[PDB]
Amino acid sequence: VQLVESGGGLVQCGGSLRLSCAASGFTFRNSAMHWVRQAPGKGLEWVSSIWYSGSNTYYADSVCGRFTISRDNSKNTLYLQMNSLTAEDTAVYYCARFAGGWGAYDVWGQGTLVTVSDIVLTQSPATLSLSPGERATLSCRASQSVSSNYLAWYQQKPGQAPRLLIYDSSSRATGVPARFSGSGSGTDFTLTISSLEPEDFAVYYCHQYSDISPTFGQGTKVEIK
Amino acid sequence: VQLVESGGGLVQCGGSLRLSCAASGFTFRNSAMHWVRQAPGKGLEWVSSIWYSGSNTYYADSVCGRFTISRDNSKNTLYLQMNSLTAEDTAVYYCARFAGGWGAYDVWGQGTLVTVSDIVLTQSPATLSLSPGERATLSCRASQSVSSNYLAWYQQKPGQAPRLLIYDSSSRATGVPARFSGSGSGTDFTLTISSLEPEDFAVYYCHQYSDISPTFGQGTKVEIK
């Protein structure tokens, strides 16, 4: 009882591929077949399952519609139809089966690798618990230096749209009170609120617009305590 | 100066949508548009760009090929062509503007919501630094109660396939030495290695197979000290 994976290799951002699992040593037609993948450096992640007869298919949320799982009973082979491939889909792809109706995967193929061809903004603290009158201070650390302070900060309240507060690190947009000020150079930038008002509690994103592909931080939530 | 987004709503797993941004208060010709999306509960993420006239377009890595960005000056609207939609694409999509040649987004639409059609296994510790002969203990925390007979442990060595060790919390696969043992119920499960041998240093994953969508733990790495 073995499983061998074929197809796969290197593909572009958006290409297409078909994976095959050649199944021997057992009665392919009645068992259930599955695909499990593992990105490099990461953990096992389940891809898809064909459950006995065709047309009874299930996919992970991430690979729905892009991936199609098929079985040819006569050839004892299992198929995976990968379309719209993204860099996040790169991984080693295994096929896996359990004997019987349901259970744990006890047979794993050798796996076949699929490979598909930016600055990072880190914001700290994740949460800021403050009170009015207090001095909020917010940090943004770029994984690389960012030229001539092409950096901005946005305030955003639940349901409302992002609102521009600071552009080019230290200059204030229209309608933003004096309390707001930005500073910092190179890789590290700081957003300072001299005194918090009731209206000031919101999420705050730093934004870099240096290359053609801008980036955002994950946000720092300034909330009451 | 205003921006109104339309289209969007509910789509199936693999469907498509076209987003419209109705632009007033400015001369559409003179400046360039961007789409920024924000999944619910997460931060801003930049999608795509038209830079003045058509054929000058740029996309994010995750949206390669699947999205086409379009604007027609004459009707004062901006278009976003979403295909092959995944659960990862559901979000509020904004259109955004900066005056002049380039800068930070100071004009933001209201956004329009797109929604596209789960036990979490947390493993501790991430790394276990031990020496042969010592006892190892590994934990697996399910985000919700999980029945016995639906939880498994896998051993995996670099360049090899996952190896099934425990099924049904306490039952050992064939050929698994006695030192290995599992335990735990409900939300908490434990893998114990009585005495560590050379062959035992590897990564170890917990696995739950209760629904049609199995899940894996992020892994616990057991390395020599």
Residue numbers in the entry:
A (entry chain G), B (entry chain A): 2 to 118, 124 to 231
The authors write:
Diabodies are among the smallest of these bispecific antibodies. They are constructed by connecting heavy-chain variable fragments (VH) and light-chain variable fragments (VL) with short “GGGGS” peptide linkers. Therefore, the two VH-linker-VL chains associate to form a dimer with two antigen binding sites, each consisting of the VH and VL fragments from the different chains. In order to investigate the structural flexibility of the Fv interfaces of diabodies, we have determined the crystal structures of 10 mono- and bi-specific diabodies with and without bound antigens.
Although changing Arg83 to a threonine substantially reduces ambiguity in predicting diabody structures, they remain significantly diverse, which limits their use in designing protein nano-assemblies. In order to reduce this structural flexibility and prevent chain shuffling, we introduced disulfide bridges between the VH1 and VH2 chains in the Fv interface. The sites of the proposed cysteines were designed initially using the “Disulfide by Design” program, with the crystal structure of diabody 6052 as template. In order to examine the structural flexibility of the disulfide-bridged diabodies, we determined the structures of three of them. All were designed by the “Disulfide by Design” program using the crystal structure of the 6052 diabody as template. The three diabodies have practically identical structures regardless of large variations in the crystallization conditions. Some of them were crystallized in a buffer containing a high concentration of salt and organic solvent while others were generated in a buffer containing polyethyleneglycol. The pH of the crystallization solution ranged from 3.5 to 8.5. This demonstrates that the introduction of a disulfide bridge can essentially freeze the structure of a diabody under a wide range of experimental conditions. The disulfide bridges we introduced were located between the Fv domains and can essentially lock-in the relative conformation of the Fv domains in the diabody.
